[PDB]
Amino acid sequence: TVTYTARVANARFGGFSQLLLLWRGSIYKLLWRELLCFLGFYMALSAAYRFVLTEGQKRYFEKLVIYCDQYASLIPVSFVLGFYVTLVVNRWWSQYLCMPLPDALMCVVAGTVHGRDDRGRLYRRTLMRYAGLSAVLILRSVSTAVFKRFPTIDHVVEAGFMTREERKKFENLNSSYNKYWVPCVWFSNLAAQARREGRIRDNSALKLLLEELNVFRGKCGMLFHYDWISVPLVYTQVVTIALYSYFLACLIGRQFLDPAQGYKDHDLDLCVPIFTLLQFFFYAGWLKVAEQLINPFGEDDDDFETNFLIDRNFQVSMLAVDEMYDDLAVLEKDLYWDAYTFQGSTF
Amino acid sequence: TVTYTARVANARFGGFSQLLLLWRGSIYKLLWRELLCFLGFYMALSAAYRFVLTEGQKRYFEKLVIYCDQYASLIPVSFVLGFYVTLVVNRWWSQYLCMPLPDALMCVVAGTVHGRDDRGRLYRRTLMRYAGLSAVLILRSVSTAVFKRFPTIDHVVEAGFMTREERKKFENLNSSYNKYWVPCVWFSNLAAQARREGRIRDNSALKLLLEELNVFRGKCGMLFHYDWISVPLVYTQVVTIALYSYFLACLIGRQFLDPAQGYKDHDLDLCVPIFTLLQFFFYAGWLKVAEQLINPFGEDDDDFETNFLIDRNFQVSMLAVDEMYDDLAVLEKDLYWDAYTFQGSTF
Amino acid sequence: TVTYTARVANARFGGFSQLLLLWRGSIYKLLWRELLCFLGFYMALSAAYRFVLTEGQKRYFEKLVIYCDQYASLIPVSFVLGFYVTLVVNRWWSQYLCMPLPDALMCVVAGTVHGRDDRGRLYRRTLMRYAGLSAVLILRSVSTAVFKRFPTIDHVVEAGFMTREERKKFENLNSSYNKYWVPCVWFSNLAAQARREGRIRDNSALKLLLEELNVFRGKCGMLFHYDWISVPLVYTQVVTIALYSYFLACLIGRQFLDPAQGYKDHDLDLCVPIFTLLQFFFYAGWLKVAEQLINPFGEDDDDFETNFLIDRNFQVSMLAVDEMYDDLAVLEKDLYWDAYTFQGSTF
Amino acid sequence: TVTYTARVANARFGGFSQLLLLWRGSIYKLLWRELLCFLGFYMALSAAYRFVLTEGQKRYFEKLVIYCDQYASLIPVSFVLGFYVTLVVNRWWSQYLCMPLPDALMCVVAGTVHGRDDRGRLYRRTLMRYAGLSAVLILRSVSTAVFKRFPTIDHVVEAGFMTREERKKFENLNSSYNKYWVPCVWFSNLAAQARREGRIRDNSALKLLLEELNVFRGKCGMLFHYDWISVPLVYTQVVTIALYSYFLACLIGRQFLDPAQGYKDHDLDLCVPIFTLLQFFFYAGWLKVAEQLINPFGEDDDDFETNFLIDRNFQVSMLAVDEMYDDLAVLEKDLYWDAYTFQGSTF
Amino acid sequence: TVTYTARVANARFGGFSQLLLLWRGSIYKLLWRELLCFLGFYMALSAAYRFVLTEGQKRYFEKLVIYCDQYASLIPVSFVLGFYVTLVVNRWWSQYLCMPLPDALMCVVAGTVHGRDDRGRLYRRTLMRYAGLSAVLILRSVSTAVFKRFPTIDHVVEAGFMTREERKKFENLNSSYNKYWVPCVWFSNLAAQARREGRIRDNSALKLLLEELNVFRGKCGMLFHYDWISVPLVYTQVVTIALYSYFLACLIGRQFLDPAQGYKDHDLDLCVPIFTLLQFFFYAGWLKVAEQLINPFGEDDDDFETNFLIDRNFQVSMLAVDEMYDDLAVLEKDLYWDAYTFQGSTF
Ligand SMILES: [Ca+2]
Ligand SMILES: [Ca+2]
Ligand SMILES: [Ca+2]
Ligand SMILES: [Ca+2]
Ligand SMILES: [Ca+2]
Ligand SMILES: [Cl-]
């Protein structure tokens, strides 16, 4: 994730111009290799036309260039590209919204699971750790960065998210499918035990805990579903082929023809195809943004910071349910007890 | 479902190029027959023009080709195609999101339905089996793969989702409509019985169970509704006719005319209509993706894996509510009890 | 509703081609009269130009035809048509999703309203009948098919949805607005009475019943709102005028001019305007789909089957709450008690 | 609101043609003045060109007309207009969905607030009146029609929505912001008092009442937010300028030039610019629909009927909670106790 | 926020024309500098062509101008601009909807937290102050205006949102991440303490309080997420480059060429490029609206009034939970106890 929100707080004279000088998470970084390859192929073809082909071969090549220039518009590059990019971007934001967070669960646990002794601390910490463990399992299933951080369940145990006994129970479970849900069932069982023990004082509190757990588990399952159901491969292949074929055609149709031949619209020999290069930049860059966003759990610059989120979530949950439990400041009267540096359209 | 999420984790130099070599769930697989038919018809027309027609017939054919080329643009192929494909894709993702899953219900049941003896196991297993049976019934109603797996209710009984006594009750019910909902009413009655028996310990737990059951049943009903209310047949017919008529016109208008006739824009005889073939590839491929996604419960490569989901859901639910019930590891202090391989825009 | 989901389960070679042979709920059925009128007017104008007008009149007519052909593009037919059709289609699916269904309510009632005697049956049946009656009232308010089935409240009473005493109470209520909500208030009062009587055993059950009732009543109210707030009449008039004016202009601009006059682009006299007819087919068909879908409660082939839904809902609700109440099969061990015909991207 | 749903129940031969004869809430009503002004300016320019300018001035004017005709396409009228209209229409439907309705609250109150004596009637009536008063306050804040009906809080008191004592409390509250929320806090306090008094019999009933109150208050707040956060003024100014500049350019570029000058595409002098007038009609009408819908609480024909809704809501709420409370017909066996005028795709 | 809802209540003859005279929050204010720079560069190039270049240099410049004019269309300015602006506008409205509001929480607190003595006042005021403090913390994290108002936590303490003891607890918490959530955990702990003390009378009331708290905290977290996950920098760079390159090309291609050279379409020398300036105005203005809306928490005229909202929310919450608690007017019979200044489509 490359954040630039602060730079664009206000619309200024050189507002978006300053952002053109950024390299990390930039379009130049994503596309310079492809732009170089396109320019090299175009230059090779141009040099062959200028210095290799004979006069008759040059005449035939000019006819072919005119033909390609006139008929390359038949490829609906923008038609397919726009739909594909819209689908990818919508999926991208939806996937970000599906990353589980323990904030609601930690607030509920701090408010509902009680006891200042070691057993109450154990209950709260274990519930939050079960939530975090389920999140870690799903993330290592769907994210390459998290998987690299946790290439085995032994790594998860050493990171403290799972214990050795929990590891034994986890591995002894006979199931050929992803087990990211197991900590959620552990959470349900532990919450039921706490309610039966009196640590959770009422049935409404247990119900709220279970509802928060279901929301968390649903976000984990949504992450799994997004990982499984990719964007249809047909769409990806179609857009890739459209872009590739269009610019392969432009390699010929956008060639500078000899101005002495009087061809319509071929009157200025600029050598470098500035506008063809700009069009390639824009279209290939659109597709490259789609490529980067299609799997936002990779290791691109603009991909989600899943490891940072794991660390932050675990730290915050443990703090909230252990250090902050029943640790309020005395009720004091505030500043305005005795009371800077629109009413409507019809009023 | 053809998953390629891992291949596209990062935006690489040859990122989407590698995906062009996939056959299963590809555009080539879906469209090679149609492309071959179009090319064969075009080649037949070209050969007839080149070797059969007389000089005057050729002149008239050239006039007709020019006429078709100039007036085939009147058919709004992209206008209708884009709207149709957008509608189909939105319905496709919505339908996937409507497939029932027992995860929330299994967590609630493991947390709320109690008893380590045979009766408690029976309660939990039967509740999860009722959910799974309702899902199986709706899926065999709407999915051809599931129906092939379960062509009769006898198959459902032999698969273990229904018992013989439940089968008798199910068949004795006098109703001419789909009975996918019957297991949900069984679930409600059984949950009420468990609460009255004391297995469910509080009214809040029963309420949460019923809410989860309603969510599950609502997803089943949404699957039924999507199966019933197809995309309007008028739209399908209109898009099919638009594509067919446009490319039937292109069969004539895209013909290579004799360059010796001096016709504007007919100067190079390439024989093979490369760009016409590419345009057909793209437009027909867009419509073929729509065709494959319109009913995502068929047997296409990219259709949903409903049988796999049935098996996974049943296995996971049974495991969670039977083997994992009240089977927690002792409360142990975690690694960080005593405590790898951004704050905001204004900070 | 014309359902063709099964025909399109798989993407086949002749996939959407087979659907072109359907008449009921087809584009041909909706548009053949208009296509015939357009063709007749075009043919009348063509015959007048060919056999009536004098040479000078023909020259002026040719000038007018060229003028109309060149300036008819100024009418943004697709621009307005696409937005209108998108709005109509979104409203159409939303309206279908707003049709009330008693499934959630029937499950809750079967689980919460108790008693195997006559009084308990009366309670459950009356609650479900109140829901069904409210749905019937709203549907006869908004649907022409339902209104034809129930042209008076006497018809509703004879259909069994309302009793004579309930009819007296309903008619004695002094209100000038639609009374579809009255059965919902009856439902609330009856549920409160049942809870006070002990038939509903806990306050949570009553709360769940009231929440389900509110969801049902909200769907009824949404149906009322969609019926009341039509698509803005300005949009309908604008799209109708755009289509009509565009094709009235095409009646002149698309005329076949005498090829002996050497007019640019008028070189082939085909008599029949194939592409103009195809363009009219597509655009007028788009508008006709909008026309059919704008009020989906009419009597079009693709309109919702409201009477079928009323019958199905009443039958299923009565069955679920009366015959299926406390009618479970004994708890039996299932097939897999002792245990056919993907893990992630990083795995 | 101009409702025409019944007229469009079925797709008929003259389906949308009949709607062209409606005046109230029509495009003609909204746009005839602007169309007349455009036509008058065009005619003035045409007369000046025909009868005032000298030959050399006419030649320069013809050059300017050709220049304007060719370069007026640079203004992206449709590009900005479509986005603006889509935004406005989405906001319009969202705003309609945000108008508070007392139906859910009245059902809950009739089911939960008890007592057939004067005190129970007082409780129910006062709760519903507090909801209605909050709605009235917000509506008079955001709607010009409601404000005209209630130009002062004295008008609200005389309408019966507020009492004199409540008025004293309302005015004594020291707050410089809109007070539409005050009746909701009164509702919360009164519901708490009723629960403490025993009129509300359980804590779940009070919770459901408070949840319904929060939904109602949230809709009121959404109305306030929509009133406050207008569509960005930049967008409105940009679209207005685009339309105005485009058609000011068309005033010159669409002029009929002398056919004797042989200018390309200027061969027929029709005097009246039929297609330019039609294009203005369509584009200006699109913007006028946006103008009418941008604030749907004004006094346009198609604006929401806020006063009617206020009256209906108050009448229905009072009826439901006072006359219909505990006023059920005896439990009678229905018609079908002893039992007119699809199963799936795979079946 | 520049509100103009009242000005546009009705569609009038000079409806949107009046809005063109507004300066604050206008397009002119945002874009006059850029328009001036573009005009100055164009004028410099024009003067150089007219008075500096030699005849041969002028011929080459004319060729280059024609080349740029014909090939500048290859840059898909509108294609990228529309998608970018749509994304930005959707994010803008979503971000506004995510600003936390205490209305629901204040209603719940006034209805559930009881006691007319000093301790009850302390409880209610402290709960609402915790909500407001969490909102202030997140807003100063994401908003530059709020941060300027509260550049340090000392400023927050002096504003009365935090106490000195709460400040000590807040700073002693060992966490490297944003602490906006800490007041929410304080709220949970304080609500639990109040319930244990009897101030909250039932478990359902505590559950409702915790649910409202979770909604509030979720909106705060959504604000944080929107601040963190910016619009992809690739999209911003691509749109900026597209606009800049297109209008840099127009600087040359839109030059007025010497009419004596007989160049096609260069016949009228107007000196000032009116339509090029209008096109720049529209496209650059679209991008400037995107720039202003991309971070709606800056200090633009149309940015959200976060400080006003903070003040209003605190004042209203304190009033509702302190002055308005248990402060109802006696239950009086209303005006209509004894009872101004549509039924459906089928009726
Ligand atoms: Ca990626
Ligand atoms: Ca399929
Ligand atoms: Ca209809
Ligand atoms: Ca209005
Ligand atoms: Ca800003
Ligand atoms: Cl609840």
Breaks (C-N over 2.5 A) in chain D follow: 339, 341
Minimal CA separation from E325 to chain B, in Å: 30
Torsion of CA D197, D190, B211, B114, to 10 degrees: -40
Nearest to C227 by CA among C140, C102, C131, C101: C140
B141, amino acid identity? S
Nearest to E102 by CA among E325, E327, E324, E314: E314
- The SS3 assignment for B255 reads coil
User: Got the DSSP string for D247-310?
Assistant: HHHHHHHTPPPPGGG--TT-----SS-HHHHHHHHHHHHHHHHHHHHHSTTSS-TTS--HHHHH
Pair of tokens at residue B322: 């039977």
Q: Is B342 on the interface with E (CB under 8 A)?
A: yes
CB-based contacts of B302, cutoff 8 Å, min separation 6: A232, A233, A234, B1, B2, B25, B292, B293, B296
Nearest to A213 by CA among A100, A292, A98, A293: A100
Contact C343 A227 (CB under 8 A): no
Resolution in A: 2.3
Contact A346 D295 (CB under 8 A): no
Chain D hits for A347, Cβ within 8 Å: 141, 147
Mutate: best of D147, D156, D203, D223, partner A, most A CBs <10 A:
D147
Chain D hits for B227, Cβ within 8 Å: 344-345
Q: Are A8 and A16 a contacting pair, CB within 8 Å?
A: yes
- Residue D15: nearest ligand to its CA? 3
Minimal CA separation from C295 to chain E, in Å: 10
Chain A hits for E230, Cβ within 8 Å: 1-5, 8
Contact E278 D237 (CB under 8 A): no
Mutate: best of B150, B179, B228, partner D, most D CBs <10 A:
B228
Chain A hits for C338, Cβ within 8 Å: none
CB-based contacts of D124, cutoff 8 Å, min separation 6: D109, D110, D113, D321, D322, D325
Minimal CA separation from D172 to chain C, in Å: 36
Nearest residue, CB atoms, E144 vs list B342, B343, B346: B346
CA pair distance D309, D314, nearest whole angstrom: 8
Q: Is E342 on the interface with C (CB under 8 A)?
A: yes
Q: How far is CA E67 from CA A43, A240, E60, in A?
A: 20, 30, 11
The count of CB pairs under 8 A between chains A and D is 25
How large is the greatest C-alpha to C-alpha distance in chain C, in angstroms?
98
Which residue, chain included where needed, has tokens 């047949």? B233
Angle between helical axes of C103-112 and B203-228 (0-180°, round to 10):
150
What is the number of residues in chain D?
A: 347
Estimate the share of chain B in helix, then strand, then coil, as percent rounded to the nearest 5.
Answer: 65, 0, 30
Residues with CB under 5 A from ligand 4 (ion): D 292, 295, 298, 300, 303
Minimal CA separation from D286 to chain E, in Å: 12
State which approach was used to obtain the coordinates: cryo-EM
What is the number of residues in chain E?
A: 347
Ligand 4 mean position to D304 CA, how many Å? 8
Chain D hits for E267, Cβ within 8 Å: 63, 66-67
Nearest residue, CB atoms, B282 vs list A72, A75, A218: A75
Torsion of CA D296, D299, D300, D301, to 10 degrees: 110
Nearest to A270 by CA among E67, E252, E263: E67
Which residue, chain included where needed, has tokens 């005619």? D43
Pair of tokens at residue A66: 């005119």
Torsion of CA B286, B288, B291, B293, to 10 degrees: -70
Q: Is E346 on the interface with C (CB under 8 A)?
A: yes
D92, amino acid identity? W
- The SS3 assignment for A115 reads coil
Nearest residue, CB atoms, D343 vs list B144, B178, B295: B178
Ligand 6 mean position to C135 CA, how many Å? 27
Nearest CA in chain E to B347: E141
CA pair distance C247, C257, nearest whole angstrom: 18
Chain C hits for A297, Cβ within 8 Å: 345
Contact A142 C343 (CB under 8 A): no
Ligand 5 mean position to E239 CA, how many Å? 17
A42, amino acid identity? Y
Q: Are D129 and D322 a contacting pair, CB within 8 Å?
A: no
Contact A275 E74 (CB under 8 A): yes
Report the Cα D137 to chain-centroid distance in Å. Answer: 18
Question: Phi and psi of E113, rounded to 5°?
Answer: -95, 120
Breaks (C-N over 2.5 A) in chain A follow: 339, 341
CB-based contacts of D198, cutoff 8 Å, min separation 6: none
Chain C hits for D26, Cβ within 8 Å: 233-234, 237
Question: Phi and psi of E279, rounded to 5°?
Answer: -65, -45
Tell me the Ramachandran region of residue B242: left when phi exceeds 0, alpha when psi lies from -120 to 50, beta otherwise. alpha
CA pair distance C330, B165, nearest whole angstrom: 8
Ligand 2 mean position to C6 CA, how many Å? 10
Nearest residue, CB atoms, B328 vs list A190, A233, A244: A190
Number of H helices, E strands in chain A: 13, 0
Question: Phi and psi of C102, rounded to 5°?
Answer: -90, 10
Q: Are E64 and E252 a contacting pair, CB within 8 Å?
A: yes
Q: Are C110 and C325 a contacting pair, CB within 8 Å?
A: yes
Contact E227 A320 (CB under 8 A): no
Q: Are C298 and D9 a contacting pair, CB within 8 Å?
A: yes
Q: Are E297 and E99 a contacting pair, CB within 8 Å?
A: no
Contact A141 C342 (CB under 8 A): no
Q: How far is CA A274 from CA A279, C18, D165, E74, in A?
A: 9, 49, 77, 10
Q: Are E346 and C178 a contacting pair, CB within 8 Å?
A: no
Chain D hits for B297, Cβ within 8 Å: 345
Q: Is C142 on the interface with E (CB under 8 A)?
A: yes
Nearest residue, CB atoms, C346 vs list A142, A177, A228: A142
CA pair distance A232, A235, nearest whole angstrom: 6
Q: Is B97 on the interface with C (CB under 8 A)?
A: no
Nearest to A62 by CA among A40, A46, A44: A46
Chain E hits for A28, Cβ within 8 Å: 237
- The SS3 assignment for E200 reads strand
Instruction: Compute the Cα dihedral for C284, C288, C289, C291 and give only its sign.
Output: positive
Contact B178 D346 (CB under 8 A): no
CB-based contacts of A87, cutoff 8 Å, min separation 6: A231, A235, B89
Ligand 3 mean position to D47 CA, how many Å? 49
Question: Phi and psi of C15, rounded to 5°?
Answer: -65, -70
Pair of tokens at residue C255: 């005329």
Q: Are C80 and C242 a contacting pair, CB within 8 Å?
A: yes
- Residue D202: nearest ligand to its CA? 6
Beta carbons within 10 angstroms of residue C214's beta carbon:
21
Minimal CA separation from C178 to chain E, in Å: 5
Contact C19 B237 (CB under 8 A): yes
Pair of tokens at residue A178: 């992803």
Q: Are C232 and C101 a contacting pair, CB within 8 Å?
A: no
Alpha-carbon Rg for chain A, nearest whole angstrom, is: 30
Ligand 6 mean position to D207 CA, how many Å? 8
Chain D hits for A344, Cβ within 8 Å: 140-142, 178, 224, 227
Ligand 6 mean position to D9 CA, how many Å? 42
Which A-chain residues 264-303 have CB contacts (< 8 A) with chain C?
295, 297
CA pair distance B119, C331, nearest whole angstrom: 8
Contact D177 A346 (CB under 8 A): no
Estimate the share of chain E in helix, then strand, then coil, as percent rounded to the nearest 5.
Answer: 65, 0, 30
CA pair distance E229, A1, nearest whole angstrom: 7
Q: Are A191 and A201 a contacting pair, CB within 8 Å?
A: no
